Design a protein around this ligand. Structure first.
Ligand SMILES: *[C@@H]1O[C@H](CO)[C@@H](O)[C@H](O)[C@H]1NC(C)=O
Ligand SMILES: *[C@@H]1O[C@H](CO)[C@@H](O)[C@H](O)[C@H]1NC(C)=O
Lengths: 48, 50
């Protein structure tokens, strides 16, 4: 079971993480049944 | 999930993910019914000492 828990928070801090409490609600309970040992996030380029 | 009780209306604001509820004994105290998605509270039937 691949569990994705998510939370969106309106913040106004410039650089670091805000200090506070916010519980993450479960978003997607995903039935994959596969082995995961390594990950990589995806960014987006800007072209001009 | 099997059990005995009276099913009543409830005022517990369940979150979308949340389906059932559990008491201290871990016995189910509220349940979300399939097909109609409503939240039914489960209150044990009246009992006591004769
Ligand atoms: C997952 O993969 C790693 C290496 O790829 C392996 O050592 C590990 O035993 C695997 N786990 C399962 C549950 O297949
Ligand atoms: C059947 O159950 C689904 C939830 O699993 C619900 O969305 C749907 O409205 C139900 N349909 C009927 C006809 O009860």
């Amino acid at each position: 079971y691949f569990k994705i828990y998510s939370k969106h928070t309106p913040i106004n801090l410039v650089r670091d993480l805000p200090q506070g409490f916010s519980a993450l609600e479960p978003l997607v309970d995903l039935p994959i049944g596969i082995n995961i040992t390594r990950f990589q996030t995806l960014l987006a380029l800007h072209r001009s | 999930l099997t059990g005995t009780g009276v099913l009543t209306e409830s005022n517990k604001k369940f979150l979308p993910f949340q389906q059932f509820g559990r008491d201290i004994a871990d016995t189910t105290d509220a349940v979300r019914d399939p097909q109609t998605l409503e939240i039914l509270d489960i209150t044990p039937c009246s009992f006591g000492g004769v």
